[model samples]
Target: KPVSLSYRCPCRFFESHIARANVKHLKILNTPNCALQIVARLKNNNRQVCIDPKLKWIQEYLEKALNKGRREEKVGKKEKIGKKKRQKKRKAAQKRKN
Candidate 1:
């Protein structure tokens, strides 16, 4: 699917990306201002495609994506800490069974 999208969204992105592709699933985030904002999961590498209409320029959107990518690293670390805590609790409960 093509990653480059503009203000003429939904219709443009659909024709270029979603029409002739194998989309595993589609999720409509919300319907506002008579526009259906959605996300499409591609059948390759579990990749996702979506149009961000909050910005008027593609460059601005790309910059935002980069910033979001940076924040996602911290989010992943937090998830890992939660998983570790759960594993520790399970180990403690098992040892107490003696």
Candidate 2:
């Protein structure tokens, strides 16, 4: 079975995978739940990400690692900030108006 984008797997399998792959960058992306959400956000930004369709099987475990509180805080901050409108505008030259 494949690992769920996390560095976790059955002990033997995990060891074998590490030994087989020549990994230059061994990054443990956010917890599984965070990683899943990140994949969606990345796709929204027109960046591609790969996630397992069978994620449901691991949902319970992932949710345990999910920092839902942090997620809500981030969302709230984004909404509060809204769009930044230009607080200043340059006045056009009267002669250039023509």
Candidate 3:
């Protein structure tokens, strides 16, 4: 699957996949808004093939396929709020255990 991408993030260091291709037509475009805006586009003669390094890293580093969602480090407070009900349930369980 092609990696889902998001740009114009407000993090300290913008993180985005860097695509380097051997094929001739790979085109990467810069973001006009922010120099740090982590943006690019690629046109491949072949199907969108991920570089071996990234594919290897993902397969080796990830034990299984990842479920896409907001990263905790990126959305810490919002994530906490989103999981409030679940947290309450867990707290209740711990209280009962205690």
> Which candidate ranks first by TM-score, i.e. highest?
1
Best by lDDT: 1
Give the TM-score of each candidate.
0.30, 0.20, 0.23
Question: Which lDDT tens digits does candidate 3 get at residues 1-98?
Answer: 46557653332232234344433332222225333222223344454332222344333322322222124445433233347444552112233333
| Runs in model 2 lying further than 4 Å from the true structure | 1-28, 31-53, 68-98
* Rank by TM-score (best first): 1, 3, 2
Compared with the true structure, what per-residue lDDT tens digits does model 1 show for residues 1-98?
67556445343343233432455565544333334444657766466775443424433544544554343245432243346343542212233344
Order the candidates by lDDT, highest first: 1, 2, 3
Q: Could you tell me the lDDT of residue 51 within candidate 2? A: 33
Worst 10 residues of 3 by lDDT: 61-70
lDDT of 1 at 3: 55
Stretches > 4 Å off in candidate 1: 1-15, 31-34, 51-98
Clashes of 2: 0
What are the runs in model 3 whose C-alpha is more than 4 Å off? 1-44, 54-70, 73-81, 89-98
Candidate 2, run of 10 with poorest lDDT: 11-20
Between prediction 2 and prediction 3, which has the larger TM-score? 3
